[PDB]
């Protein structure tokens, strides 16, 4: 069956070199092009870029020329996307797909994650207000991070988001519950952030200001 | 290079036709390929050379193109088709392939929701640590497709900022947040800060000051 | 839990006191213990049949004379041209001057520029293959 495997999973550092894969089986991967296109966190897709590995010839698109290197050694049915130094806009997932306009095969996709790897324990601040009160994590290393109610109590209602990738690569969420405006000074509410990686758990109480 | 429009949020009934539009100048020229895309999960095509449909895509899936806009239409949709649809061509000029932005058709199944916004200024203690962190919290609405807008005075701000990408929560509505980490000095120096949210056209926004 | 014991080119009916049944015409069962069997892949239009379908397995299909086959399992045909031309919108069209394709299909390349490296061009390139580069400065005059 033709193939497209493509290299695990990344994770650099700003500055450091990068060198993804793939390798295409089951078919002549001589005389097929491969596509390299990316993707970046909820964004749409982009051609970065083909190679016919046959002579190596090798195309790029204006928003990547001499950014990327795009290689291929046929003799080992591998198509390559190189870079020299890594820039924290790098984050993305990186697809390989064979063809130059029609993309009938795609790889299982690379994901490259470029940030300071010094792992940091997060700061909780509080968000002071049905009102909604709020808990904020910032700036730690690595995911995840699980935020409870006053001790896994408030249930209904509560959201803890995604966490973002801020230009210092540290990452930073929040949790929000829709308590009755009506209830205030009757019940202290508090959330629980914990950081596995840190070993951090610190709780501290929202109260309006 | 080359430049292909889709509307970033296309809405459609059960059962009723969608239609996705991929404007470019002379697309008519080229052959148009979608592909569909779904969370986790490579891209697949849908419709290649304009009209042709591969073997396993259901017939409701159509295809056109001809002047400036080549256009996918799903008749009978159903919600297994909610997904990410990218147009594509390619070029000899350049002998480039491009990607149109991406239009994510939702199939509704519950009625529109326009967007709770609240805005948090930075608690003292964060700004005791010489940071500050505005956070503007979206939540309640559907479909999941909102642009932040960060103002400071009328002014805008796009320097340090990052938002979240929508996700279902408990209710089935939508939710997502944005992060302005400006500097404590840049706080109190300026008058007003409204963070303006634009869902299906509509925007809101809410502002706070010291 | 029952239905593990029809094997592929049957499926299986709860409803039946023999639970297997074979599938039926123009379908297929290929792994067993299936509650349905597929229907065999057609093969139409621009479809040519490759491997007639059975009962374990399904039809595979390869592309009319003048196409080749894209996707996984030849799920599209795209057009063959000859070599030394490209597949534009408007029909299959010559490579321009300059570029070459040595495949039925695909678009044209252009030749490798031997003027780059010092080299003079040894047999001129067409639009069927590329150019072969004659040895460099060092080796044609220096060794
Ligand atoms: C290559 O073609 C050019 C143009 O016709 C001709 O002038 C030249 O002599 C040719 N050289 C060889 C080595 O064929």
Redesign the pocket.
């Known amino acids: 069956e033709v193939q497209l495997v493509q290299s695990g999973a990344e994770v650099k550092k700003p500055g450091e070199s990068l060198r993804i894969s793939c390798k295409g089986s089951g078919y002549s991967f001589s005389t097929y092009w491969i596509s390299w296109v990316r993707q970046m966190p909820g964004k749409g897709l982009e051609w970065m870029g083909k190679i016919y590995p046959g002579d190596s010839y090798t195309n790029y698109s204006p928003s990547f020329q001499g950014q990327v290197t795009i290689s291929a050694d046929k003799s080992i049915s591998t198509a390559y996307l190189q870079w020299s130094s890594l820039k924290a806009s790098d984050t993305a997932m990186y697809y390989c797909a064979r063809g130059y306009g029609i993309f009938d095969y795609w790889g299982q996709g690379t994901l490259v994650t470029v940030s300071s790897a010094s792992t940091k324990g997060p700061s909780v601040f509080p968000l002071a207000p049905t009102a909604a009160l709020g808990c904020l994590v910032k700036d730690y290393f690595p995911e995840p991070v699980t935020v409870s109610w006053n001790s896994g109590a408030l249930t209904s209602g509560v959201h803890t988001f995604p966490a973002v990738l801020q230009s210092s690569g540290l990452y930073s969420l929040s949790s929000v519950v829709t308590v009755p405006s009506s209830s205030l000074g009757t019940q202290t509410y508090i959330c629980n952030v914990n950081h596995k990686p840190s070993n951090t758990k610190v709780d501290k109480k929202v109260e309006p200001k | 290079s080359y430049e292909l429009t889709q509307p970033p949020s296309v809405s459609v009934s059960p059962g009723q036709t969608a239609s996705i539009t991929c404007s470019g100048d002379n697309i008519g020229d080229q052959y148009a390929h979608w592909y569909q895309q779904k969370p986790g999960q490579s891209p697949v095509l849908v419709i290649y050379q304009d009209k042709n449909r591969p073997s396993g895509i259901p017939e409701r899936f159509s295809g056109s193109n001809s002047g400036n806009t080549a256009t996918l239409t799903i008749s009978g949709t159903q919600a297994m088709d909610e997904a990410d649809y990218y147009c594509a061509t390619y070029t000899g000029f350049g002998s480039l392939a491009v990607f149109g932005g991406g239009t994510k058709l939702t199939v509704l199944g519950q009625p529109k929701a326009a967007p709770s916004v609240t805005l948090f200024p930075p608690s003292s203690e964060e700004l005791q640590a010489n940071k500050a962190t505005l956070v503007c919290l979206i939540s309640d609405f559907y479909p999941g497709a909102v642009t932040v807008a960060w103002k400071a005075d009328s002014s805008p701000v796009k320097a340090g900022v990052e938002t979240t990408t929508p996700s279902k929560q408990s209710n089935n509505k939508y939710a997502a947040s944005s992060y302005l980490s400006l500097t404590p000095e840049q706080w109190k120096s300026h008058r007003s800060y409204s963070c303006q949210v634009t869902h299906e056209g509509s925007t809101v926004e809410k502002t706070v000051a010291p | 839990d029952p239905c593990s014991n029809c094997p592929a080119g049957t499926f299986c009916d709860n409803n039946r006191n023999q639970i297997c049944s074979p599938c039926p015409p123009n379908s297929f069962s290929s792994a067993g213990g299936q509650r349905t069997c597929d229907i065999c892949r057609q093969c139409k239009g621009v479809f040519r049949t490759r491997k007639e379908c059975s009962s374990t397995s399904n039809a595979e299909c390869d592309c009319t004379p003048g196409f080749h086959c894209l996707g996984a399992g030849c799920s599209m045909c795209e057009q063959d041209c000859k070599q030394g031309q490209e597949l534009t919108k408007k029909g299959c069209k010559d490579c321009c001057f300059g570029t070459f394709n040595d495949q039925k299909r695909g678009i044209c390349r252009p030749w490798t520029n031997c003027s780059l490296d010092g080299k003079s061009?040894?047999?001129?390139g067409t639009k069927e293959r590329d150019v072969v580069c004659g040895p460099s400065p060092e080796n044609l005059y220096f060794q």
Do not use: A, F, K, R
Request: glycine share 0%.
């Open positions: 061009v040894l047999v001129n």
